[PDB]
UniProtKB/Swiss-Prot annotation:
GO terms for cellular component: extracellular region; spore wall. Its main location: secreted. The keyword ATP-binding does not apply. Homodimer. Homodimers further self-assemble to form highly ordered films at water-air interfaces through intermolecular interactions. Disruption phenotype: Leads to wettable and fluffy colonies. Results in thinner hyphae and impairs the formation of aerial hyphae. Induction: By C and N starvation, and by light. Keywords: Cell wall, Conidiation, Disulfide bond, Secreted, Signal, Sporulation. Aerial growth, conidiation, and dispersal of filamentous fungi in the environment rely upon a capability of their secreting small amphipathic proteins called hydrophobins (HPBs) with low sequence identity. Class I can self-assemble into an outermost layer of rodlet bundles on aerial cell surfaces, conferring cellular hydrophobicity that supports fungal growth, development and dispersal; whereas Class II form highly ordered films at water-air interfaces through intermolecular interactions but contribute nothing to the rodlet structure. Belongs to the cerato-ulmin hydrophobin family. The keyword Cell cycle does not apply. It is found in: Secreted; Spore wall; Secreted, Cell wall. This is Class II hydrophobin 2. Disulfide bonds join 3-52, 13-43, 14-26, 53-64. It comes from Hypocrea jecorina (Trichoderma reesei).
């Protein structure tokens, strides 16, 4: 899995991870992301970055972590 199970188990495409903890303008992937490369390429197509967050729904705010092996 691209995201660790538990707290940061939700893969989201976000503009940036403020202070490396707060995903901004996060959006749920529109295709299955089964590998880090696909995850990253898909988000990139949205001008975003692959982040693993606490919730599968982006309401703004939102605690996130960088997807392992990206950037």
């Amino acid at each position: 899995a691209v995201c660790p199970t538990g707290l940061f188990s939700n893969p989201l495409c976000c503009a940036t991870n403020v202070l490396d903890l707060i995903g901004v303008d996060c959006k749920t992937p529109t295709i299955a992301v089964d590998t880090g490369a696909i995850f990253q390429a898909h988000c990139a197509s949205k001008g975003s970055k692959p982040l693993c967050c606490v919730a599968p729904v982006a309401d703004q705010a939102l605690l996130c972590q960088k997807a392992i092996g990206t950037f």
